[PDB]
Structure 1
Amino acid sequence: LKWPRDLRPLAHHDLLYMGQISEEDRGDFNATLRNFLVPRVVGSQKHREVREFIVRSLKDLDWDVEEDCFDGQTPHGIKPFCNVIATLNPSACHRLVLACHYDSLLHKEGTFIGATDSAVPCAQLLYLARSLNGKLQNQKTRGDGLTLQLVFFDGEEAFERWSSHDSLYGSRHLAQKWHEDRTSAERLESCLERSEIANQIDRMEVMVLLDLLGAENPRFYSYFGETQPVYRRLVNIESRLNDAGLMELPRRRRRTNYFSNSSTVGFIEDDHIPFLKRSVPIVHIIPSPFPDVWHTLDDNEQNLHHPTISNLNKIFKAFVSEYLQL
């Protein structure tokens, strides 16, 4: 079956513009990132500060920001959780959803920063909103029934040994909440002709979940046949950015090959699962294998690879520009 939205290839001019990172932008990205490079375990003050920073940053860009807050039982007793949902144009029927988790693992060995997991993805989402704000605010005025939505899930991490009951607290909660929140096309602005909308879940046109990003030379694959048409756009954008000489590599004439033009057979537990179960299309931008530093005390700022981050930011900016025709 074809993708429901006809995917217009990004014009050369727009590819080149989205693939430019100024010195200012690097500074802006890193300043944003600094806010997330702190331990932010559920229940903590720094976690509350990170949540408030996400909310403030997006309200400042005139996005609609909602907090889905609830208390949930855990192996460590009742804990407070708050998903942050930011929507550029709430009334637009369909959403391109980008997502990540903002909580950090409570690591028994010691203080855990979770730089790839997922401080970098958090900063990448905010950086996208900030750096594309002008074009996004113009797109919002079109009445075309499509918008951008950012979801920062809380409580993705297990408190003790991973289980279905001890993990994905925020995403399980939100998926249920949105499934039970009924709506229809006539209540919404410009749904696509043959859309089947019965609840808020159905308005998630695709969810692009970023996780474990920031390490050198990640390998992505298409995890879901459902979203192969969208995944192939990431492969294409990456290829075009290399053709254009806009990727940072250690030597001339090398190319990035992050997005493999292949599928892989693997099952990863992450925030997409509760939405996958309600047939939300998923693109899971997570490396395979996981970064070497995964769930170790070395998942910290200095083990980040800045040229990779810059390259990923270009791909993501170009992807959002392509999808939303910015």
Structure 2
Amino acid sequence: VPLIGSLPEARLRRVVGQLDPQRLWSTYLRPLLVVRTPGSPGNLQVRKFLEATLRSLTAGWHVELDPFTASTPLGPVDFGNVVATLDPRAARHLTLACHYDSKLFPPGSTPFVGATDSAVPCALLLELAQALDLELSRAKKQAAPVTLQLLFLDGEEALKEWGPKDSLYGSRHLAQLMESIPHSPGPTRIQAIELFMLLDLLGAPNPTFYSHFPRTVRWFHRLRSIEKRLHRLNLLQSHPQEVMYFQPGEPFGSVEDDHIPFLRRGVPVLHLISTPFPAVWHTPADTEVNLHPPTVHNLCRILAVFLAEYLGL
């Protein structure tokens, strides 16, 4: 628990104190819980909600929009991703990512908003960024060498049948775009991704995560470690055992997600996705009241230390 690279408890406690669960849940989560398929009005409001929420933050992220067209198993659809980079002159960054679109389902069925998939994750990032705003604003001003980059991806889903030409429209393009952009050192923006941490299927009760890439397993250990740790310093609601979320040790793997286009380009990936998937997954039942708010908040706290331990805040 008093290991190496770790937060002096004092700070960690303030780090956690600063998180506002009412804000996570209602400023940030509640608004997104809406049908938001590609290029639908649903979509575009979320897109603009994020596009703003990020800009208002005091530390003044560079918020830029990656938009495009693509050929689907339906018409052409247009998409826009949301790239938010706290200090883009900085030479590397930690890229956290998630997708704001929602899976189009056939009509005449209870709309599908997908709370775990991926409403909850998006809001976790919004909270991270806001509950850590002064501290990022410090290090940004300190021309810190590794900054923070947040991706809110569009078009992960699939209209019709899931497959390599219908899925991950957004990541596939963002990746395409990044490697075409000279950065320094680099050579591309793609190499500026120190870690690509990807959040998915989050907020159902009683998840289990495993390391899925052994190249990043040590970071996964940070998380198991940060879980302990918060349990010990009593800062976890409904957490009987010491190890609940972050399991040992190193299983099989692969589960096509937004990381893939980056991983094709050699990007170290940490796939923070519950496995087994939420019971309610891809049903009209992915909805605000199946979430397990304690779990939702433990994962805010657990990430919110990690962020800090990572960027030394």
Task: Give the TM-score normalised by the residue count of structure 1.
Answer: 0.91
User: How far did 1:231 drift?
Assistant: 1.2
SS in 2 for 1:302: coil
Q: Determine if contact 1:218/1:288 at 8 Å carries over to the other structure.
A: yes
Q: Which residue in 2 is equivalent to 1:18?
A: 15
1:289-324 per-residue CA deviation (whole Å, 9 max, x = no partner) reads 000111111001111110000100000100101111
Structure 1 match to 2:5: 8
Number of residue pairs the alignment of both structures matches: 305
Partners of 1:66 and 1:85 within 8 A in 2? yes
Matched, 1:48 2:44: yes
Query: 1:238: Cα distance to partner?
Result: 0.6
Give the Cα–Cα distance (whole angstroms) in 2 for the partners of residues 257 and 270 of structure 1: 24
Q: What displacement does 1:229 show?
A: 1.8
Contact 1:249 1:255 in 2 (8 A): no
- Give, in whole Å, the separation in 2 of the partners of 1:256 and 1:297: 31
Residues 245-260 of structure 1: pairs in structure 2 closer than 5 A: 245-249=234-238, 254-260=241-247
Residue 231 of structure 2 is aligned to residue 242 of structure 1: yes
Does the 8 A contact of 1:248 with 1:311 survive in 2?
yes
**TM-superposition CA deviations, 1:60-91 (whole Å, max 9, x none):** 11211000000110011100100100011111
Structure 1 residues 267-306: Cα deviation after superposition (integer angstroms, max 9, x where no partner): 1010000111111110110001000111111001111110
Q: Is the 8 A contact 2:230 2:236 kept in 1?
A: yes
- Does residue 198 of structure 2 align to residue 202 of structure 1? no
Alignment-derived partner of residue 171 in structure 2: 171
The question of whether the paired residues in 2 share the 8 Å contact of 1:20 and 1:314 is answered with no
Q: Is the 8 A contact 1:247 1:256 kept in 2?
A: no
Matches within 5 A, 1:1-326: 8-20=5-17, 25-31=20-26, 32-61=28-57, 62-108=60-106, 110=109, 111-185=111-185, 197-249=186-238, 254-326=241-313
- Partners of 1:15 and 1:241 within 8 A in 2: no
Q: In structure 2, how many angstroms separate the alpha carbons of the residues matched to 1:130 and 1:175?
A: 26
- 1:30 positional shift: 1.3
Give the secondary structure class of the aligned counterpart of 1:149.
strand
SS in 2 for 1:68: strand
Partner of 1:190: none
Give the match for residue 191 of structure 1: none
* Distance in 2 of aligned mates of 1:245 and 1:232: 20
Amino acid aligned to 1:314: R
**Is 2:91–2:184's contact at 8 Å kept on the other side of the alignment?**
no
The offset of 1:174, in angstroms, is 0.7
Q: Alpha-carbon deviations, 1:221-256, whole Å to 9, x = none?
A: 010111112111111111110111110017xx5435
**8 A Cα contact 1:249 1:256, kept in partner:** no
How far off is 1:266 after superposition?
2.0
Matched-pair contact (CA < 8 Å) for 2:209–2:245: yes
8 Å Cα contact 1:33-1:119 kept in structure 2:
yes
C-alpha deviation, 1:144, in angstroms: 2.5
- SS for the counterpart of 2:5 is coil
Q: Which residue identity does 1:96 align to in structure 2?
A: L
CA deviation map 1:113-139 (0-9, x unaligned): 100000000111101111110111011
Cα offsets for 1:182-237 (capped at 9, x unmatched): 2332xxxxxxxxxxx21110000001100010100110001011111211111111
CA positional deviation for 1:21: 6.4
2:247 is paired with a residue of what secondary structure? strand
In structure 1, runs of 5+ residues without a counterpart are: 1-6, 186-196
